[PDB]
Amino acid sequence: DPGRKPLSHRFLRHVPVVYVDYPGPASLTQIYGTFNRAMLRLIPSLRTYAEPLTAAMVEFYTMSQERFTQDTQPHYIYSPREMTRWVRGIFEALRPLETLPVEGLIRIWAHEALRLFQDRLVEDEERRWTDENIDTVALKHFPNIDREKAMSRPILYSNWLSKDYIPVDQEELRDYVKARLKVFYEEELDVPLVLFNEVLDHVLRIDRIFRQPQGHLLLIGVSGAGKTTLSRFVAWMNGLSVYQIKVHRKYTGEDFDEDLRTVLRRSGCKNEKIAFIMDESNVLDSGFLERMNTLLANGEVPGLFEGDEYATLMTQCKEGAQKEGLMLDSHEELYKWFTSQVIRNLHVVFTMNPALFNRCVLNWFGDWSTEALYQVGKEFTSKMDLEKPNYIVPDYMPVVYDKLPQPPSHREAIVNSCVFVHQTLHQANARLAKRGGRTMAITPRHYLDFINHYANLFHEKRSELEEQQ
Amino acid sequence: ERSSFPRFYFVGDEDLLEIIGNSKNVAKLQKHFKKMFAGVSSIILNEDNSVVLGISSREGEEVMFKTPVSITEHPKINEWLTLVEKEMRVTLAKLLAESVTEVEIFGKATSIDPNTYITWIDKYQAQLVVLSAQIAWSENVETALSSMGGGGDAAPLHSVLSNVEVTLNVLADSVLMEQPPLRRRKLEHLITELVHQRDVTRSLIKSKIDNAKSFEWLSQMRFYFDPKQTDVLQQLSIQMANAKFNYGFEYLGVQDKLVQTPLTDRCYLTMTQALEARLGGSPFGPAGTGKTESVKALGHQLGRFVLVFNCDETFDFQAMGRIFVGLCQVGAWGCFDEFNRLEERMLSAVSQQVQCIQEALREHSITCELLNKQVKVSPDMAIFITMNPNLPDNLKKLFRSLAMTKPDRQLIAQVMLYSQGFRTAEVLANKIVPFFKLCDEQLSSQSHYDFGLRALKSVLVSAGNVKRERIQKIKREKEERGEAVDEGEIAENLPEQEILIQSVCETMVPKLVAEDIPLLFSLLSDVFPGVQYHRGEMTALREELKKVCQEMYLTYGDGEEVGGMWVEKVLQLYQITQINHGLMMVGPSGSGKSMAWRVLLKALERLEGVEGVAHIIDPKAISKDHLYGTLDPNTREWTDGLFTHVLRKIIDSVRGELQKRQWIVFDGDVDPEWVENLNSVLDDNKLLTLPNGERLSLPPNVRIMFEVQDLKYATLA
Amino acid sequence: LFQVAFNRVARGMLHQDHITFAMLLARIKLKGTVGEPTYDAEFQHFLRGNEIVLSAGSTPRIQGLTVEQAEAVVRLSCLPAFKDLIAKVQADEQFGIWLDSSSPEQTVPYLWSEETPATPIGQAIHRLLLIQAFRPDRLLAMAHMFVSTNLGESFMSIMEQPLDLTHIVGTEVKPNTPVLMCSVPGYDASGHVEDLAAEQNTQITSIAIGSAEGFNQADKAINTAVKSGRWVMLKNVHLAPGWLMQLEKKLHSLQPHACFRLFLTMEINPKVPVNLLRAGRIFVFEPPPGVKANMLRTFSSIPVSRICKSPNERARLYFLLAWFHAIIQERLRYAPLGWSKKYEFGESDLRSACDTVDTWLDDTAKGRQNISPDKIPWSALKTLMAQSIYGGRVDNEFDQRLLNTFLERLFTTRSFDSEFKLACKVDGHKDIQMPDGIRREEFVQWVELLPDTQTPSWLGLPNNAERVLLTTQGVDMISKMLKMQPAWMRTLHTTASNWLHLIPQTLSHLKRTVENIKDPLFRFFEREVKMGAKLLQDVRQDLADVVQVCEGKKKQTNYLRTLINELVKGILPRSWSHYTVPAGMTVIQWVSDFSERIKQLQNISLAAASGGAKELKNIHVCLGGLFVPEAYITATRQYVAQANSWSLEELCLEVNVTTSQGATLDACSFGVTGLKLQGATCNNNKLSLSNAISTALPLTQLRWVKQTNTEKKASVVTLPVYLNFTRADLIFTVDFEIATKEDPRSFYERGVAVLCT
Ligand SMILES: Nc1ncnc2c1ncn2[C@@H]1O[C@H](COP(=O)(O)OP(=O)(O)OP(=O)(O)O)[C@@H](O)[C@H]1O
Ligand SMILES: Nc1ncnc2c1ncn2[C@@H]1O[C@H](COP(=O)(O)OP(=O)(O)O)[C@@H](O)[C@H]1O
Ligand SMILES: Nc1ncnc2c1ncn2[C@@H]1O[C@H](COP(=O)(O)OP(=O)(O)O)[C@@H](O)[C@H]1O
């Protein structure tokens, strides 16, 4: 593994080394059967289903491990830590609630399976295979269930609407998120957000990670896809203070460390939760990568605070402890309290395009899918009158949008044409890459620019011509 | 202050401030005298420390001043330093005149009394005895040529050759018997010098040269001494071909001299013409062929002092610039080491600097701008730059070239072997040199292997010492059984192929891997046929080893038996401890090292009766500053490091540990960061230097011992 | 367009590349016109003939045709237009006379068979193919003639004329553009522009680039000249590439005066920034390749006052020095034969030699009007120019021997006789004569009246040296034009498949035995077998990785990325090259060579398995086939020393060149094949000078005999043995007895050597 230097043969000569591997499937079966029985002790009516739940969880974990090997992608590692996180999630869901039928339990179980074993996937057929396996295993182990209710496709869990973490309809969730966006536009920065189902799922994922302590998530996906904008959205909606490091060519290691000290003292002394958004553009050196590795592993980096900075940090820690209600004199206890405060209050989120993997959460934002692109097309080409009564439905439709109405209206057809033009840009860039010529990554920022240019041209030329008319 | 007495332009500016602070302390200036001179290590002073009586070298050989300089009369540091230099030059010149008188009395004689020759040799320093020999030989050959100039005249050149031959026989007799090591080095320098003189005289007699202006005599270096000259500096004039130079009259201490190879005299001629044409030389060629060493030897023969700027990562710029301007002020020579290893911008910077200085030199054929200072280039200034294939473009038109592609190894191995009193030196050299050519190729390559020319020279030295020990042992035996003792009689009946084989075994067989040993035996069979060497077991030590192995639960065996190879390795360890004060037991982890040296220490203590005390120190665990000692930024106080602490403890001899045997086992990895300061101990100097200025001598019982697992980062130095 | 394009491009190229560029423009204009066909087959074969692999049975060994001539003949015959070439060659009788003709490209016979008459350009390209196949030494001239056919005879008629730099500075160059004069080492172009500034009555500032103050003066002069319109000139600006980039940036955003001109006198080194080369008009100056022109240059360089001093014999000494310097410098151009590597025998050597002669003759003749020829310190000059000057750069022993031969032949009291021969049999029986004059004017006149028909015999090489040089230049033409002209993935798959097919599959190791470990020949051969096995497995696995990547089943790793890129560009992979190899050998010939080496090693492994060391002794290895051949010679030395219980140092090597069939396998004798002699013929172990470029030695026998300690006969000569034609590595030295009436000094001068391959 990287950063791991094999030790001197002289040292190996002394110390015997024993290999501690991933537990076997039966070992996992027992290990988490005990946890599942303890968890389902919360609801006695569901205690007889604990063992088959463990069997299904183990079977799905083994399928995912045997199918999604690390060779395909560096982050395709599934450890028993993921299974523990699974059980912890099911427990956090089941705790505030008092009763559930089997169907609600299996909905929670499938939701956690989606959030752990499917959110990290890059390619779409991988996600389809994951969904198929989840449904199949839920059928095999849990036959006497109504499959429509238990695993209804819009598996969206949220607590913004109800008091608890019960499933939320995508349409009602869309209405609520629209209202919260209206507040966001009114108070913070104003750019248009169109709420395709992908944004709903991704905002739910970002919020779920934010709400938990020591929340660190890996926002990997093509630039312009809304990762940092959705991150700021969830940060404001959840009260968290968004922070990105202003990075330029002058920005050396020392300025990075000063910003690190600022955010660390804010999230460990003032008890101010801070969402630290970081980008590959902000990482000018692998030193930044190793410092963040240490911060994510231990919850604090000893290399930040020394000397005068150490003394000021301990003064701030003493003041904060006096305000909170904890009386600690020595520097070590205050350091431990401040480390706990940071690990409970700071949430870092990393935006991209085996330790951090399996110690964080990687969500594959990817690029806007056909549905998303088509909703983009409508929403921003809503103002202009792209409505022609003379339009004749062609016998054959390229049908780039799958869910296009069977009669396409004029606006629907032209927005389909825009989605097609983006798809063909992707195909042309892919062909240029295959031929080996230099290519350039086509982003949804290009799509937004294209729509804006369309609106400007249509408005100007239609205006002049109609002025002549 | 800097301009006056420019000799401390060499030492650092912080060290210059240190010297200014210690101006009222002559005992703290010894490091600076080490730095700025060639072989000078300390100035001899009286108990008052108010007048400098003389100077010494690293080897302990000391020069007494004809007129000592009273520091009280000249309180200024620069004034009395300049007086010290002037008086050292004058004293060296006067001692040279005396020694040349003594040898020319010794010369032109049918026979030489060994007692008088040894007395004269001990009277003067090694450099002065070699130089007086050269002056006398040159004057004799010049006089013989002047007599021959009648045209077809009979030759007193035969007489001069006979004189050199009989003196050479005297030296070959004297080196054989036990002598003090300093006089041994003097004898070795004299014998190699006289071998060169004999060979050039043979060339002259073969070519039937008749005229003192004939170019065949003009090519060979001629030394002219002019005692009538009022200025002592100019009294000696060294001249080769067209070029002529004055003698630098700077102390060399004792230096390793060269065999004066045909390649070496070719280089001497080319460089001497180059400086005559007022431009430096660039003797390129593969590393290890004596380029840097040949330049050093040429500067030494002129009496000028050479600065070897090693060009590696350790190379600096500001320090190089200041020592460079100092080179220009004083007139000493400077020989860059491998230049192509420099950084490109580094290379361009130093190239522009040396180009400016060289343009100043050709102008003098006068000041040049160095660090915004106009510097009067001394005409004696010279710059050499060895390369390993080229010269920067700004320097191609300023510097000559020469290909030192291959020094004659046979001549070197013959001259040095003859310098050790070996008979049949030519046969042994013509055997050993092809053998070392075989070793560098046929043997499996390893990082620690070194079959370079220096390794050959070391093997020859070891063989000479082995022969001396054997003749001493035979003399003791003959004294016990009988009384008929005659050194020549023992030497005549003393095999020398066996001596060379034993030496090569004792120095190279330990370095061999488990597979190369049969290959070395086959090579010895090929080059030295029929002659084999069987190491005499140390039966008392073998019994002590068996008893110690029994006491430590270790296994013991003899040869083929289980543990035999480990036992042999222990014995080789003992031999290297006997013949070396520095050791390295290289081997993969858990091979034999700790147990081998522990068992040998205990067996030695139980045999010889000398207590064994070991200070196992791991070098990497402790920081380098903490290993040797820390420097106080304010008071310079010496918090002696762990190794410095144990060495000082042993030196102070509080509990009689000098009588005890001390092994400082440096268990751990070895890198060229800490060992750079310890390299000053593993040489023949056997002394430790510290950044305060205090120097500690290694007691003979202390055996520096490196227990390492591998040498991927061990410098070949 | 075509004419001005050539006359503006070739003015900034090496003289050898003029014909390259002209032929490229010829191809362009051939494609531009419609009447002539495509000629894709003809040009493709003309560029890729040497890539077609042949067989021993493929060569009919036609009478009057050499082996390589036969290969070229059959390779051209593969083309349909040249299918009947062999029949006409064997039928024709006039062919033999045209084959060795002085200029055969002028009267190229009609051999290619066609149904319809061809256009003149078509006949020209057919004759180009014929010349390349038959007399490639003339390929430069035939390409000149083809370009004359296509773009007109007087297309090049400008480059021979002196560069009219007045018309080029007055117009056609912008004042913003810098004038670049990139001259090869040993030349300065500053003179031409000084004469220009004089003849245009233009005040020019001449600043050198040596240090920071030079930078300041250059910048101040540029700032004054940009507004005042005067001309500025900088010397040797290649010394400061970074400051030169800064100057590029300064001039780019700078409007100049109309009369302003910036001249940068430069050296041709890769250290010059690409940006200035793109942003300025370049001019290449090369010294004229002539002994006579070299002597004129030397005499013009040396001031007249210095050469005419008190000893009247000084002029003859200076003339002899100039002749020797010219001989050495123009021997440089024939690098494989005239030397073994390109030394820098520049003007510095000549200036130092002049100073040496001056000071020594001042010594000997202490202000005497005349000094006797015997009093001339000939030994002093010979020794200095043999060791200090012209010898310092000389690293090889044999180059030093050659320099000594030249110095002893020229520098002697015998030179001052009216019958002195500065050269012998330059053509036929004629030979040059030393001028009888005693003054500089007489020698300058004599060299000016030189025949101007210099051959290689003028400077001591065999007259075939010029033919070899022209063949090398033609091969350089082919390579450069080939360089001047996804699918590459498929073609890489095809070629990797071909190489995997041709390279042998696997090589067996040798079985270690104690008796076999004792033997030195077995040790050397097992080391060679191990090295060959490791490299063969490496290359086979690399090719397997390559082909699997070609089918897409594997992805291009970084190491595989570099390997694939290097295969694409034809550069030899570093990980593949572990043994010493000719510098310019491309990957395909490397693969052929490696295939041959592994075949030989397989043969020796089979021989060792069949028997042992006793059979391993009688294997006729070829020194080229072995990765380290000097290891083989040392192994033979050790084997004979072990067999006869002698010392190694007391052994010497004797050479008995005999036929492979008529060979005796003495216990001291080892068979070595493939040795070739450069510039001589050996008959019954007797050397004889000849004009044949290379004589194949059928089987060399290496015999080790004890040192006889007898002085070598004056008729024996020491011949260096090099592994390759570049002669950068020395394997060992043999001693051959030259036949009667032969001069060993001539053998040294003609660069006779043995080549392993
Ligand atoms: N003669 C012997 N007989 C039996 N066992 C031995 C003998 N010599 C050494 N050993 C054992 O072999 C091992 C070598 O121990 P030791 O500490 O000396 O190794 P080492 O070569 O110095 O290792 P390292 O390079 O790691 O420091 C130990 O287990 C020791 O007991
Ligand atoms: N659902 C969405 N609807 C409309 N615009 C969006 C949406 N998601 C992202 N964007 C647009 O993307 C732009 C910037 O995306 P950003 O968050 O910077 O991408 P990333 O975080 O991947 O770098 C914003 O201007 C925003 O308008
Ligand atoms: N003329 C000589 N006489 C004796 N020994 C020599 C001579 N030249 C070189 N050597 C030996 O060869 C080694 C070459 O050392 P070095 O000066 O570093 O060579 P280089 O200058 O090629 O790097 C020296 O250690 C020395 O022992």
CB C477 within 8 A of CB C143: yes
Q: Report chain A's terminal Cα–Cα distance, integer Å.
A: 71
CB B49 within 8 A of CB B26: yes
Which of A2, A96, A107 is closest to A53 using CA atoms?
Answer: A107
Residues of A in contact with B709 (CB under 8 A): 8-10
In three-state secondary structure terms, C502 is helix
In three-state secondary structure terms, C334 is coil
Buried b (16+ CB within 10 A) or exposed e, B611-621: ebbebebebee
Residues 6+ apart with CB under 8 A from A105: A46, A49, A53, A94
Residue B699 backbone dihedrals phi, psi, to 5 degrees: -65, 150
Question: Which residue spans within B322-405 are E strands per DSSP?
Answer: 333-336, 367-370, 373-376, 382-385, 400-403
| CA nearest to A12 within chain B | B589
Q: How far apart are CA B265 and CA B259, in angstroms?
A: 10
Which of C117, C8, C136, C133 is closest to C62 using CA atoms?
Answer: C133
- Chains B and C: how many Cβ contacts under 8 Å? 86
What's the gap between Cα A246 and its chain centre?
23
* B591 CA distance to ligand 1 middle (Å): 6
Sheet hosting strand B306-309, strand order edge to edge: B306-309, B333-336, B382-385, B281-284, B400-403
Residue with tokens 């070519």: B207
| Residue among A196, A197, A220, A229 whose CB has most ligand 2 atoms within 8 A, to mutate | A229
Contact A9 B589 (CB under 8 A): yes
Q: How far apart are CA B324 and CA B383, in angstroms?
A: 10
Written as six digits, the tokens of C417 are: 């006789």
Written as six digits, the tokens of A386 are: 């792209």
Q: How far apart are CA B324 and CA B332, in angstroms?
A: 10
Which of C672, C669, C645, C648 is closest to C660 using CA atoms?
Answer: C672
A272, burial (CB in 10 Å: exposed 0-12, middle 13-18, buried 19+): middle
Distance from CA of C631 to the nearest CA of B (A): 8
Task: Cite the DSSP H helix spans in B618-716.
Answer: 624-628, 642-652, 675-682
Q: Report chain B's terminal Cα–Cα distance, integer Å.
A: 37
Instruction: Give kind and range of the element (H or E) at residue B245.
Output: strand B243-246
In three-state secondary structure terms, A99 is coil
CB B249 within 8 A of CB B303: yes
Side chain identity at residue B279, one-letter code: L
Task: Give the torsion sign (CA, C295, C298, C302, C307).
Answer: negative
* A268 CA distance to ligand 3 middle (Å): 66
Distances (CA, A) of C222 to C47, C173, C178, C182, C263: 48, 18, 12, 20, 11
CB B438 within 8 A of CB C634: yes
Written as six digits, the tokens of C386 are: 């043999």
In three-state secondary structure terms, B150 is coil
Which of C110, C121, C153, C105 is closest to C39 using CA atoms?
Answer: C121
Q: How far apart are CA C422 and CA C406, in angstroms?
A: 10
Instruction: Give kind and range of the element (H or E) at residue C718.
Output: strand C716-722
A330, burial (CB in 10 Å: exposed 0-12, middle 13-18, buried 19+): exposed
- Count CB-CB contacts under 10 A for residue A48: 10
In three-state secondary structure terms, B334 is strand
Residue B661 backbone dihedrals phi, psi, to 5 degrees: -95, 125
DSSP state of A167: B
Residues 6+ apart with CB under 8 A from C46: C125, C128, C129, C132, C478
Residue with tokens 């088959």: A52
CB A345 within 8 A of CB A273: yes
Q: Which ligand has an atom closest to residue B265 CA?
A: 3
A163 appears as a binding residue in the annotation = no
Which residues are paired to A447 by β-bridges? none
In three-state secondary structure terms, C741 is coil
Q: How far apart are CA B279 and CA C351, in angstroms?
A: 13
Count the alpha carbons within 13 Å of B295 in the hemisphere toward its beta carbon.
30
CB A130 within 8 A of CB A77: no
Distance from CA of C344 to the nearest CA of B (A): 10
Distances (CA, A) of B403 to B272, B433, C332, C395: 16, 21, 19, 5
Q: How far apart are CA B12 and CA C452, in angstroms?
A: 64
Q: How far apart are CA B557 and CA B292, in angstroms?
A: 48
Task: Give me the torsion for CA of C606, C611, C615, C616, rounded to 10°.
Answer: 50
Nearest Cβ partner for B403 among C394, C517, C641: C394
Which of A29, A85, A78, A84 is closest to A55 using CA atoms?
Answer: A29
Which residues are paired to C430 by β-bridges? C427
Own/partner long-range contacts of C285-288 (Cβ < 8 Å, ≥24 apart): C285/C181, C285/C182, C285/C183, C285/C184, C285/C187, C285/C189, C285/C192, C286/C14, C286/C15, C286/C183, C286/C184, C286/C187, C287/C184, C287/C186, C287/C187
Which of B643, B621, B639 is closest to B705 using CA atoms?
Answer: B643
Which region holds residue A384: left if phi is over 0, alpha if psi is between -120 and 50, else beta? beta
Residue B328 backbone dihedrals phi, psi, to 5 degrees: -65, -40
| DSSP symbols for C277-316 | HHHSEEEEE---S-HHHHHHHHHHHS-HHHHS-SSTTHHH
Buried b (16+ CB within 10 A) or exposed e, B556-591: beeeeeebeebbbbbbbbbbbbeeebbbbbbbeeee
Angle between helices A410-434 and A444-468 (to 10 degrees): 140
Q: How far apart are CA B362 and CA B276, in angstroms?
A: 11
CB A295 within 8 A of CB A348: yes
Written as six digits, the tokens of B547 are: 């008893």
Largest CA distance in chain C: 90
CB C548 within 8 A of CB C697: no
Q: How far apart are CA A141 and CA B358, in angstroms?
A: 91
Helices (H) and strands (E) in chain C, counts: 30, 16
CB C539 within 8 A of CB C574: no
User: Is the CB–ligand 1 distance for residue B554 below 6 Å?
Assistant: yes
In three-state secondary structure terms, B326 is helix
Contact A9 B669 (CB under 8 A): no
In three-state secondary structure terms, C263 is strand
Residue C513 backbone dihedrals phi, psi, to 5 degrees: -145, 150
Instruction: Give kind and range of the element (H or E) at residue B45.
Output: strand B40-45
Contact B393 C631 (CB under 8 A): no
Q: Which ligand has an atom closest to residue A8 CA?
A: 1
| DSSP symbols for A36-71 | HHHHHTTSGGGGGGHHHHHHHHHHHHHHHHHHS-TT
Task: Give the torsion sign (CA, C126, C132, C135, C141).
Answer: positive
In three-state secondary structure terms, C711 is coil
Residue with tokens 């520095």: B582
Side chain identity at residue C104, one-letter code: P
* B445 CA distance to ligand 1 middle (Å): 26
Q: How far apart are CA C544 and CA C558, in angstroms?
A: 16
Q: How far apart are CA A27 and CA A40, in angstroms?
A: 20
SS3 for C57-88, per residue? Answer: HHCCCCCCCCHHHHHHHHHHHCCHHHCCHHHH
Q: Is any Cβ of chain A less than 8 angstroms from the Cβ of B709? A: yes
DSSP state of B589: S
Side chain identity at residue C209, one-letter code: I
Instruction: Give kind and range of the element (H or E) at residue C527.
Output: helix C520-550
Resolution in A: 3.5
CB B227 within 8 A of CB B238: no
Angle, CA of B76, B79 and B82, to the nearest 5°: 145
| CA nearest to B708 within chain A | A10
Which residues are paired to C179 by β-bridges? C263, C281
Which residues are paired to C204 by β-bridges? C231
Strand duo B243-246 + B236-240: pairing: antiparallel
Strand duo C669-673 + C621-622: pairing: parallel
Contact C359 B242 (CB under 8 A): yes
Count the alpha carbons within 13 Å of A189 in the hemisphere toward its beta carbon.
7
Written as six digits, the tokens of A331 are: 């520097």
Side chain identity at residue B376, one-letter code: K
Which of C683, C697, C669 is closest to C738 using CA atoms?
Answer: C683
C252, burial (CB in 10 Å: exposed 0-12, middle 13-18, buried 19+): exposed
Which region holds residue C575: left if phi is over 0, alpha if psi is between -120 and 50, else beta? alpha
Q: Is any Cβ of chain B less than 8 angstroms from the Cβ of A8? A: yes
Angle, CA of C97, C103 and C106, to the nearest 5°: 95
Which of C396, C410, C438 is closest to C327 using CA atoms?
Answer: C410
CB C669 within 8 A of CB C701: yes
Q: Is any Cβ of chain C less than 8 angstroms from the Cβ of B219? A: yes
Task: Cite the DSSP H helix spans in B552-660.
Answer: 564-579, 593-608, 624-628, 642-652
Which of B445, B456, B447 is closest to B515 using CA atoms?
Answer: B445
Residues 6+ apart with CB under 8 A from B240: B219, B220, B221, B222, B268, B269, B272
B531, burial (CB in 10 Å: exposed 0-12, middle 13-18, buried 19+): middle
Contact C631 B441 (CB under 8 A): yes
Angle between helices C558-569 and C520-550 (to 10 degrees): 90
Distance from CA of B315 to the nearest CA of C (A): 23
Written as six digits, the tokens of C577 are: 């090259």
Q: Using CB atoms, which chains have 3+ pairs under 8 A with B? A: A, C
Q: Report chain C's terminal Cα–Cα distance, integer Å.
A: 47
Instruction: Give kind and range of the element (H or E) at residue A187.
Output: helix A170-187
| Residues in chain C after which the chain is broken, C→N over 2.5 Å | 485
User: Is the CB–ligand 2 distance for residue A224 below 6 Å?
Assistant: yes
Kindly report the length of chain B.
717
Written as six digits, the tokens of B290 are: 């004596």
**Which atom of ligand 2 approaches the CA of A221 most closely?**
22
Q: How far apart are CA A104 and CA C548, in angstroms?
A: 51
Count the alpha carbons within 13 Å of A202 in the hemisphere toward its beta carbon.
27
Residue with tokens 């001589």: C680
Kindly report the length of chain C.
757
In three-state secondary structure terms, A364 is strand
User: Is the CB–ligand 3 distance for residue B513 below 6 Å?
Assistant: no
Angle, CA of C72, C75 and C77, to the nearest 5°: 110
Q: Which ligand has an atom closest to residue B716 CA?
A: 3
